[PDB]
Amino acid sequence: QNPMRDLKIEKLVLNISVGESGDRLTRASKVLEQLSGQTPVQSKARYTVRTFGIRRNEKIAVHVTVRGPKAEEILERGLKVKEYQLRDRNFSATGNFGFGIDEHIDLGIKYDPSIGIFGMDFYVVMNRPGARVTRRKRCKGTVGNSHKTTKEDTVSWFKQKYDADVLDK
Amino acid sequence: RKVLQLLRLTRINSGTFVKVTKATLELLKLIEPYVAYGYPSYSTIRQLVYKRGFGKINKQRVPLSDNAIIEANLGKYGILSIDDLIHEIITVGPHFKQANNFLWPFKLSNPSGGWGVPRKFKHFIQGGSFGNREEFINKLVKSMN
Amino acid sequence: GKSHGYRSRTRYMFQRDFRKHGAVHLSTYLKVYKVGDIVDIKANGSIQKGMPHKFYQGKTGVVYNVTKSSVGVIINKMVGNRYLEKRLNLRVEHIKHSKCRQEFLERVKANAAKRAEAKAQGVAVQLKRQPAQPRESRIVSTEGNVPQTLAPVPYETFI
Amino acid sequence: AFQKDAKSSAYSSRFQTPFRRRREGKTDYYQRKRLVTQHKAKYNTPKYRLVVRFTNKDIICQIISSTITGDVVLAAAYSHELPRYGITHGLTNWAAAYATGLLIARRTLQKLGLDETYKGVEEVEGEYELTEAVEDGPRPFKVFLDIGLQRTTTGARVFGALKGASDGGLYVPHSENRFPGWDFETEEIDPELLRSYIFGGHVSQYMEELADDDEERFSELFKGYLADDIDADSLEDIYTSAHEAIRADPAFKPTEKKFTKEQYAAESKKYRQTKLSKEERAARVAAKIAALAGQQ
Amino acid sequence: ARRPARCYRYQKNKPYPKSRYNRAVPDSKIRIYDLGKKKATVDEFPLCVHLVSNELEQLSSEALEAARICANKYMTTVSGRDAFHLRVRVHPFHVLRINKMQQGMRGAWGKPHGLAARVDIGQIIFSVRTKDSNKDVVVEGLRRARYKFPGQQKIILSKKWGFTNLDRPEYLKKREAGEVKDDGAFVKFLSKKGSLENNIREFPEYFAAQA
RNA sequence: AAGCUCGUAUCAGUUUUAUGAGGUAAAGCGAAUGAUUAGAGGUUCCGGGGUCGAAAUGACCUUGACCUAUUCUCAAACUUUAAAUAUGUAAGAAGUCCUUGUUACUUAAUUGAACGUGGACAUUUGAAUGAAGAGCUUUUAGUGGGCCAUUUUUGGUAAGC
RNA sequence: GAGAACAGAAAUCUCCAGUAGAACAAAAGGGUAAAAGCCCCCUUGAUUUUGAUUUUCAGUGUGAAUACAAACCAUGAAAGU
RNA sequence: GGUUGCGGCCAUAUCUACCAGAAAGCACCGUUUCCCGUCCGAUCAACUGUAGUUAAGCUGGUAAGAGCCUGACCGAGUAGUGUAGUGGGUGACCAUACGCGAAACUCAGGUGCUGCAAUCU
Ligand SMILES: [Mg+2]
Ligand SMILES: [Mg+2]
Ligand SMILES: [Mg+2]
Ligand SMILES: [Mg+2]
Ligand SMILES: [Mg+2]
Ligand SMILES: [Mg+2]
Ligand SMILES: [Mg+2]
Ligand SMILES: [Mg+2]
Ligand SMILES: [Mg+2]
Ligand SMILES: [Mg+2]
Ligand SMILES: [Mg+2]
Ligand SMILES: [Mg+2]
Ligand SMILES: [Mg+2]
Ligand SMILES: [Mg+2]
Ligand SMILES: [Mg+2]
Ligand SMILES: [Mg+2]
Ligand SMILES: [Mg+2]
Ligand SMILES: [Mg+2]
Ligand SMILES: [Mg+2]
Ligand SMILES: [Mg+2]
Ligand SMILES: [Mg+2]
Ligand SMILES: [Mg+2]
Ligand SMILES: [Mg+2]
Ligand SMILES: [Mg+2]
Ligand SMILES: [Mg+2]
Ligand SMILES: [Mg+2]
Ligand SMILES: [Mg+2]
Ligand SMILES: [Mg+2]
Ligand SMILES: [Mg+2]
Ligand SMILES: [Mg+2]
Ligand SMILES: [Mg+2]
Ligand SMILES: [Mg+2]
Ligand SMILES: [Mg+2]
Ligand SMILES: [Mg+2]
Ligand SMILES: [Mg+2]
Ligand SMILES: [Mg+2]
Ligand SMILES: [Mg+2]
Ligand SMILES: [Mg+2]
Ligand SMILES: [Mg+2]
Ligand SMILES: [Mg+2]
Ligand SMILES: [Mg+2]
Ligand SMILES: [Mg+2]
Ligand SMILES: [Mg+2]
Ligand SMILES: [Mg+2]
Ligand SMILES: [Mg+2]
Ligand SMILES: [Mg+2]
Ligand SMILES: [Mg+2]
Ligand SMILES: [Mg+2]
Ligand SMILES: [Mg+2]
Ligand SMILES: [Mg+2]
Ligand SMILES: [Mg+2]
Ligand SMILES: [Mg+2]
Incomplete structure (x- = not known):
């Protein structure tokens, strides 16, 4: 069937994985701020690596989750950079999909040598209405298969609106 | 050892009557290795009492030999003679407990014929002497009384 | 060298019962104890506060005191050639009302009954318990039931 | 599920299922344990909870006690009763919360006898106050907020229902710091504001502010307030009279009903699908081995 | 240095x-x-x-x-080396200690010394499967093996089909039915328990009645 | 040793009945943990070899690891199950039931809780067997190297260890 | 497990599964899932008085512990703890 | 009989896969002025009950389903065990006598019951 198992984007999560803390990071953060409007969250390393030059709890990366029309304006905006082609991987079995771009300048955004050039991970997670079942406090349940988000359902979703290509086999 | 006391068998070859219920049957079970028992006939209850029967009177242990001795003590419950005694026993009467406790443990001699077996301390069923030997109890006791 | 701490040796005895871990069900707490009640004692490993020492596991005493969250239980423990009295402070999670007396209570209320049902009719009381009695005579029949003759059976090996 | 997921003989076997009302995500037992148990030396004394729950817009207030056979409703009151008292709209708002609790307090505290003594604050200026014990007299009826799974936020409406009960006569011990108009950064309540909610000042002021800023929305919602010609200002008297109505006669009218219980059992069993018999299932298998194995 | 058995x-x-x-x-x-x-x-x-x-x-x-x-x-x-299948039916899991040897009997808990299987009465030590047309050859194999073992053991011809748990006729009935099917060196049997669907998947050659 | 207070009273290295507690023996391992023999069927952008290759997130063998359903074998310090023997309490007059006083505890509450006053039912009054009675107090000796047998059992190849 | 630029066996982002297979200073064993674990908020009940109780036991001491009474506090909307 | 709120026992209530659900309820669901919380009004807070929906939740039913529960002279009076003997055997061990007595197995049968209050063609 189909009445209101639409395919709304649950949220968009931009991720900048820097190998390091300090100045370089706090600038990568600035990028996600002025790009999201929201004020971005930092992530500490989970263990030391020494060949990645990182210590446990260092503040290694920043990222931000954006929802509602705001997310569309950006997905679209990077989808552009990615010339509207993704790949049959890229889409998870549980529905969602993501991509990256080197150089954030390719989505509006000027240059300015006070900031530099950063890479960015785009991760789009999808769902339908009645999602709140899994997420709310009382009577926390689980969405039925006839309503869970699949791979096919999202690729064809994606293939339709945007009019973008999927590719590979 | 406790049980042999409770059944008033504290000397070899002595004997006492036991009314059978679950709650005494288990007592018997506990002491099979030490006793010989079975179902006594009228004949042998009669001659146990006539010959070797004694009452407990302010302790003491008093030969029966006159009927007034009984009526004196057991008479309260009916029972005013030596045959009255016997009758209360064999029929397990309403007053068997007093009737029977009144009787001092019988004190038998060793069997006369002998024990019939070369070793006493296995079960009757294995050619020994101990345990329930059922109605063959009379042949034995009669040779011991 | 040796070890004899408070809960030594209690590995499986304060253990929790297969598939019965977690919260204690609430009825344990809606129970109500009064002085004089007979309780059974059995430790709940999950409730560390107010726990009977292992010696009192499996034992049945009498309430002597009632408190916000506990009952005081007196148990006679026997040391040497004699008993002494012990009072135990137990949380309600380690106690339950004993059925050790339900029989009695059942038997008394019943016994007072058939005493009236007798007396006020013309007696034939008869209300002491008697032991299992031996079986009376009986006649077993054959109609539809002729005896089948069995013998012992030869040695064999299945293998 | 996917094949490398799904479960085993062993997994399912050793599985310890939780209490039903946890599997249902309805009962927090860690709180029930502490809401319900009594001092062992207060013996068979019940420990009554004021249970407040919010459905997608119905408000429930039951005064409940506990029994190992199951709990027990002393009295109950639903905000959907408020039409009886002059409240037809906005039945899940904060002042519907207060009102309903008011009803619940009166209702029981009536049928208990403590009706005339222990009235509570008749006034209502949102001053902070519990109902005190009257000098040589019955101690009041004591009660404990069973919030359920509500989050305690300073402003939440669960605490509004609390206000109305503690305003109506009940003894329900409570602090101020979750009532709207409690100041975060000064340990001090503004009764200006809390009186406002009790009477619905936030919904009123929202209405007047939507009047001349945006009539697109003001009609989408606040529809019913048009259809019945209640414009803002009167929202107080609405609830002010609701208060009086309630106190005046709270004695719970049940529904007129129509159709017997027997009757509701008729047309419902029409949709209650029925189990099968082994004889029947035996023949659904035999049938299947005839079909799928009998080589078409 | 191995102590006598x-x-x-x-x-x-x-x-x-x-x-x-x-x-x-x-x-x-x-x-x-x-x-x-x-x-x-x-x-x-x-x-x-x-x-x-x-x-x-x-x-x-x-x-x-x-x-x-x-x-x-x-x-x-x-x-022949393909002519049979020998199965040692007994794994030596029990460790044997030894008090190697100053000290005397003072503190005398041994080091491991070697391993042993613990064996019952009627416990099978070796199991062997062939063609009937080999009985003697195999029984001789077991007969000579005995000489290697302490304590009486005794050779016994089974009633069973190979390493199977069914006896010869009962195995045949089940098989010349349909309910049996080759696995590795052992075998699977159709059960009347469980899904009907994938029970017919497996064992196609049942669900006729015969052959 | 001295007794003392009582006496069918109360008493018990025993059974029965009713209600508990226990994780040993056995058992189990196609049940968890841990071990352990064998194959069979799967899965790879994902350990390595290797033929085709310009490569491939290529195909094809190959050996491994894992997964599936199976297979032989085990546990003092493993276990769902779970004995036997031992083991707690109870089987009344200090009992059961009714009427309704006391309080500063406790209840929303003359509500409860505890202790009571008044009233109703005697020995088949509440299983068995036994009871040369039961209870109680003071004071003091010797002893504080132990050894042996059946069964359980640890160390040791073993021992009249 | 399946997904995302640099990014690899291991960095950070997301979703699914997940009876606990983790974690709770430490030996090990018990115990624990809207917690007893992890993040945050507020704190000093790690306080004052003097008795009873359990283990070890002589039913002495010591250690450690339990449930109350009489205070003063903490936290929480609250039952409470 | 349905449903909701609060429950008791805590799998016959769980798990996997399908399908069916009237009416009410519950639910999903719209909103961001206000209390309130967030990297994100997803959660959490408030407002509307108006604009929308049975798709999910929920309830039930199907399955030689997985699990779980119950039964039985199914296995088995088997294993183990208290008691006995100047019983057998070099031993290891093993029979017998008077008692108590499992677990796996196998087969059959089930797959939540129920308390308080409100509500419903
Ligand atoms: Mg629809
Ligand atoms: Mg770096
Ligand atoms: Mg006698
Ligand atoms: Mg002669
Ligand atoms: Mg002679
Ligand atoms: Mg002669
Ligand atoms: Mg001789
Ligand atoms: Mg003579
Ligand atoms: Mg030790
Ligand atoms: Mg502590
Ligand atoms: Mg798996
Ligand atoms: Mg299986
Ligand atoms: Mg749990
Ligand atoms: Mg809470
Ligand atoms: Mg040496
Ligand atoms: Mg020396
Ligand atoms: Mg050493
Ligand atoms: Mg074994
Ligand atoms: Mg040999
Ligand atoms: Mg042990
Ligand atoms: Mg064993
Ligand atoms: Mg087993
Ligand atoms: Mg195993
Ligand atoms: Mg098998
Ligand atoms: Mg064991
Ligand atoms: Mg006993
Ligand atoms: Mg006597
Ligand atoms: Mg005397
Ligand atoms: Mg002395
Ligand atoms: Mg001395
Ligand atoms: Mg001395
Ligand atoms: Mg001896
Ligand atoms: Mg041995
Ligand atoms: Mg040894
Ligand atoms: Mg630990
Ligand atoms: Mg909780
Ligand atoms: Mg300190
Ligand atoms: Mg002390
Ligand atoms: Mg001292
Ligand atoms: Mg002490
Ligand atoms: Mg110490
Ligand atoms: Mg509808
Ligand atoms: Mg805002
Ligand atoms: Mg929303
Ligand atoms: Mg909310
Ligand atoms: Mg549907
Ligand atoms: Mg629900
Ligand atoms: Mg099944
Ligand atoms: Mg045997
Ligand atoms: Mg034996
Ligand atoms: Mg002897
Ligand atoms: Mg012998």
Whole structure:
């Protein structure tokens, strides 16, 4: 069937994985701020690596989750950079999909040598209405298969609106 | 050892009557290795009492030999003679407990014929002497009384 | 060298019962104890506060005191050639009302009954318990039931 | 599920299922344990909870006690009763919360006898106050907020229902710091504001502010307030009279009903699908081995 | 330096396995327990003959290993190496200690010394499957192996089909029915339990009635 | 040793009945943990070899690891199950039931809780067997190297260890 | 497990599964899932008085512990703890 | 009989896969002025009950389903065990006598019951 198992984007999560803390990071953060409007969250390393030059709890990366029309304006905006082609991987079995771009300048955004050039991970997670079942406090349940988000359902979703290509086999 | 006391068998070859219920049957079970028992006939209850029967009177242990001795003590419950005694026993009467406790443990001699077996301390069923030997109890006791 | 701490040796005895871990069900707490009640004692490993020492596991005493969250239980423990009295402070999670007396209570209320049902009719009381009695005579029949003759059976090996 | 997921003989076997009302995500037992148990030396004394729950817009207030056979409703009151008292709209708002609790307090505290003594604050200026014990007299009826799974936020409406009960006569011990108009950064309540909610000042002021800023929305919602010609200002008297109505006669009218219980059992069993018999299932298998194995 | 087996014949101790509590123990001298044509199907080898203990004792790793070879050697040079399937039915899990040796009897808890299987009465030590047309050859294999073992053991012809749990006619009934199906060297049987669907998937050749 | 207070009273290295507690023996391992023999069927952008290759997130063998349903074998310091023997309490007059006083505890509450006053039912009054009675107090000796047998059992190859 | 630029066996982002297979200073064993674990908020009940009780036992001491009474506090909307 | 709120026992209530659900309820669901919380009004807070929907939740039913529960002279009076003997055997061990008595197995049968209050063609 189909009445209101639409395919709304649950949220968009931009991720900048820097190998390091300090100045370089706090600038990568600035990028996600002025790009999201929201004020971005930092992530500490989970263990030391020494060949990645990182210590446990260092503040290694920043990222931000954006929802509602705001997310569309950006997905679209990077989808552009990615010339509207993704790949049959890229889409998870549980529905969602993501991509990256080197150089954030390719989505509006000027240059300015006070900031530099950063890479960015785009991760789009999808769902339908009645999602709140899994997420709310009382009577926390689980969405039925006839309503869970699949791979096919999202690729064809994606293939339709945007009019973008999927590719590979 | 406790049980042999409770059944008033504290000397070899002595004997006492036991009314059978679950709650005494288990007592018997506990002491099979030490006793010989079975179902006594009228004949042998009669001659146990006539010959070797004694009452407990302010302790003491008093030969029966006159009927007034009984009526004196057991008479309260009916029972005013030596045959009255016997009758209360064999029929397990309403007053068997007093009737029977009144009787001092019988004190038998060793069997006369002998024990019939070369070793006493296995079960009757294995050619020994101990345990329930059922109605063959009379042949034995009669040779011991 | 040796070890004899408070809960030594209690590995499986304060253990929790297969598939019965977690919260204690609430009825344990809606129970109500009064002085004089007979309780059974059995430790709940999950409730560390107010726990009977292992010696009192499996034992049945009498309430002597009632408190916000506990009952005081007196148990006679026997040391040497004699008993002494012990009072135990137990949380309600380690106690339950004993059925050790339900029989009695059942038997008394019943016994007072058939005493009236007798007396006020013309007696034939008869209300002491008697032991299992031996079986009376009986006649077993054959109609539809002729005896089948069995013998012992030869040695064999299945293998 | 996917094949490398799904479960085993062993997994399912050793599985310890939780209490039903946890599997249902309805009962927090860690709180029930502490809401319900009594001092062992207060013996068979019940420990009554004021249970407040919010459905997608119905408000429930039951005064409940506990029994190992199951709990027990002393009295109950639903905000959907408020039409009886002059409240037809906005039945899940904060002042519907207060009102309903008011009803619940009166209702029981009536049928208990403590009706005339222990009235509570008749006034209502949102001053902070519990109902005190009257000098040589019955101690009041004591009660404990069973919030359920509500989050305690300073402003939440669960605490509004609390206000109305503690305003109506009940003894329900409570602090101020979750009532709207409690100041975060000064340990001090503004009764200006809390009186406002009790009477619905936030919904009123929202209405007047939507009047001349945006009539697109003001009609989408606040529809019913048009259809019945209640414009803002009167929202107080609405609830002010609701208060009086309630106190005046709270004695719970049940529904007129129509159709017997027997009757509701008729047309419902029409949709209650029925189990099968082994004889029947035996023949659904035999049938299947005839079909799928009998080589078409 | 190996003590005489006489010293550990009897089952005097409680099982001392190799474990975290033990830890430093010699490897079992016997390390293969399935030789001959193990790969072979259930149908290939109907006759089963056992070497069976008549004692409550202990058998060394070394006497399992040495016996293992004795039977296997005879079996294969007389009847062929694919001509049978020997299965050692007994794993030596119990560790034997020794008080190597200053001190005297003071603190005397031994080091591991070697391994043993603990064996019951009627406990099978060796199990072997062939063609009936080989009985003698195999029984000789087991007969010679005995000489390698302390304590009475006695050879016994099984009623069972190979290493199967069904007896010959009962195995045949089930098979010449349809409900049996080859696995590795063993076999699967159709059960009337469970999904109907994937129960017909498996075992297609049932669900006719016959053949 | 001295007794003392009582006396069918109360008493018990025993059974029965009713209600508990226990994780040993056995058992189990196609049940968890841990071990252990064998194959069979799967899965790879994902350990390595290797033929085709310009490569491939290529195909094809191959050996491994894992997964599936199976297979032989084990546990003092493993276990779902779970004995036997031992083991707690109870089987009344200090009992059961009714009427309704006391309080500063406790209840929303003359509500409860505890202790009571008044009233109703005697020995088949509440299983068995036994009871040369039961209870109680003071004071003091010797002893504080132990050894042996059946069964359980630890160390040791073993021992008249 | 399946997904995302640099990014690899291991960095950070997301979703699914997940009876606990983790974590709770430490030996090990018990115990624990809207917690007893992890993040945050507020704190000093790690306080004052003097008795009873359990283990070890002589039913002495010591250690450690339990349930109350009489205070003063903490936290929480609250039952409470 | 349905449903909701609060429950008791805590799998016959769980798990996997399908399909069916009237009416009410519950639910999903719209909103961001206000209390309130967030990197994100997803959660959490408030407002509307108006604009929308049975798709999910929920309830039930199907399955030689997995699990779980119950039964039985199914296995088995088997294993183990208290008691006995100047019983057998070099021993290891093993029979017998008077009692108690499992677990796996196998087969059959089930797959939540129920308390308080409100509500419903
Ligand atoms: Mg629809
Ligand atoms: Mg770096
Ligand atoms: Mg007698
Ligand atoms: Mg003669
Ligand atoms: Mg002579
Ligand atoms: Mg002669
Ligand atoms: Mg002789
Ligand atoms: Mg003579
Ligand atoms: Mg030790
Ligand atoms: Mg503590
Ligand atoms: Mg799996
Ligand atoms: Mg299985
Ligand atoms: Mg749990
Ligand atoms: Mg809480
Ligand atoms: Mg032994
Ligand atoms: Mg030894
Ligand atoms: Mg030495
Ligand atoms: Mg020396
Ligand atoms: Mg050492
Ligand atoms: Mg074994
Ligand atoms: Mg030999
Ligand atoms: Mg143990
Ligand atoms: Mg064992
Ligand atoms: Mg088992
Ligand atoms: Mg295992
Ligand atoms: Mg098998
Ligand atoms: Mg064990
Ligand atoms: Mg006893
Ligand atoms: Mg007497
Ligand atoms: Mg006397
Ligand atoms: Mg002395
Ligand atoms: Mg002395
Ligand atoms: Mg001395
Ligand atoms: Mg001796
Ligand atoms: Mg630990
Ligand atoms: Mg909780
Ligand atoms: Mg300190
Ligand atoms: Mg002390
Ligand atoms: Mg001292
Ligand atoms: Mg002390
Ligand atoms: Mg210490
Ligand atoms: Mg509807
Ligand atoms: Mg805002
Ligand atoms: Mg929303
Ligand atoms: Mg909310
Ligand atoms: Mg549907
Ligand atoms: Mg629900
Ligand atoms: Mg099934
Ligand atoms: Mg045997
Ligand atoms: Mg035995
Ligand atoms: Mg002897
Ligand atoms: Mg012997």
